[model samples]
Target: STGSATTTPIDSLDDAYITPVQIGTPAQTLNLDFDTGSSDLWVFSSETTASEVDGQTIYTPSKSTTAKLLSGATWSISYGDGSSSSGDVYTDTVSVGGLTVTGQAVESAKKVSSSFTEDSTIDGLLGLAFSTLNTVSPTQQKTFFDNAKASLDSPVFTADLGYHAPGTYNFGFIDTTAYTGSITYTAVSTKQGFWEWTSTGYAVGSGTFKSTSIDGIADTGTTLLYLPATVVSAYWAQVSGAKSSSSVGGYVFPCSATLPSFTFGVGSARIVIPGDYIDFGPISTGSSSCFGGIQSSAGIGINIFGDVALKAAFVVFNGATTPTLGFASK
Candidate 1:
């Protein structure tokens, strides 16, 4: 009877990708893109006023078996990527990995704006990063990590982003069995938004970081790598035919077919970005001479490391048990 009371972990990774929800009586499953950049788990509700939410999966709690709203709690989150969404507080039974969370603070967004409406590929975001950045009020709602602890086998969670490859993310306990050798530790910064770091300097290939006063944030959400103006100009000068195309996605490029290697420093590690990621698909901005790897901001700024280098490294958001972060090669 005791064994029968517990269910085994879902075998397929796809099982972890989507959550089956019963809004009132009608059930709907939605794919959740686990994000750490911005908090506030938002699902476009069926009553969303956005005109573009056509085929996208929107949760309608009215039909769910359990749907309850907070009397006064409300939240709105805006991203540096120029995207935003807002909703009122509500608690519903959410089942992920076939495990049930009785009272989960599921933010129901009836209002949305920006590329979210245009890019309907994402259903919702199940934020598993940290409770500090979560938009939910600590006094009211519990984080997903706090609620899922009992169901987890070892009180640990492993994120295998090799499926998404370049874009891997994880939180809670890490399976040290995955990484060989000793793991280095860096003190986590008490900063807002994305995880930031001091860039230090750069090298053409797997070179070395020049001792410089450069600081930038490591963001997983941003696709393009952005650098301060001074850093970008300096890097471009080394490459041939890198014109100052201010409008061309802020890149300098050669008309000739030549690819360049780019790598920057993250503390002691030398992170490299692939050339293909830098070169966009020759997209045009009304004949603005668009090129890849645009000259962007460099220096101590809030710019992002972009996906180019992120995919090359294994990033761990060890928040729950460990108050540190770990990064290494795949």
Candidate 2:
């Protein structure tokens, strides 16, 4: 059946948000991180080690009549943040919001990194990237969106990440009510299984927009905005007391410092990240030392427009042929 779904942000600010997902016959609901950067639907399950699981709700396959194990099939994934998880596979009915996919491959985690185990709010991750990036072994699995596309009126989804407020992830349909202004479209190249595109250039504060190309991925699972070292250095130069810190692993500044706004070019439209958003939070509680949300994307190979930059605009991830990216002001 044709349908759509809407996901809301969890408590962690700027961190990945969670949406309720139903799996198996009886529809066991679990809070999952809807990650567009990766392609794999895995969760804490009966197979997970008890000590490894903190406050997560486990999915018991034996309780679901529709759960069928994919003999010998397994999957594993590691994130840029060093977080990882892996498990055996099972084919079952999965539902996100109101969209449902039958015979969807669901990886039941038998092992999870300390990162995943410590994050109690997220029971798993619902990957929204291209199915070509799925981690399942022998035979790659299809994501819920991939399996449901044939029935969707439009093969697309939208992300509306907010600043310390609830946001939404709408599937199959673009809620015109969710955004204002015209959506500027940009050609996206998905050779790397990500929503990769190039910004014509960027501007720091009221400075002129330089026409240098900056290529990056629109990653919802990532928390901060990452750009080229040169670009980051240029922006920080405009801010007093801001400097790269080896101990902090990025740039830092005084908590009370007034920062400048950063803007990126997407076609003719400009997406601006407010100066206040750049000040992620204090490096330590009750300390004047603050960490900058924007950092260098040196080792990552590609830049990342994470929640820090994405929250400044409404984003459309088009999955149809010749996938195009659409951005608009909130």
The digit string of per-residue lDDT tens for model 2 on 122-192 reads: 99998988888999999999988888887877888888888877778777888898888989989898799
Candidate that scores best on TM-score? 2
> For candidate 2, what is the TM-score?
0.96
- The parts of candidate 1 lying over 4 Å away from their true place are 1-27, 95-102, 128-130, 136-143, 146-183, 206-208, 252-257, 285-295, 298-301, 320-322
lDDT of 1 by residue, 64-98 (tens): 77778766777677766567777787777776544
Model 2, residue pairs in steric clash = none
Error of 1 at 161 (Å): 4.8
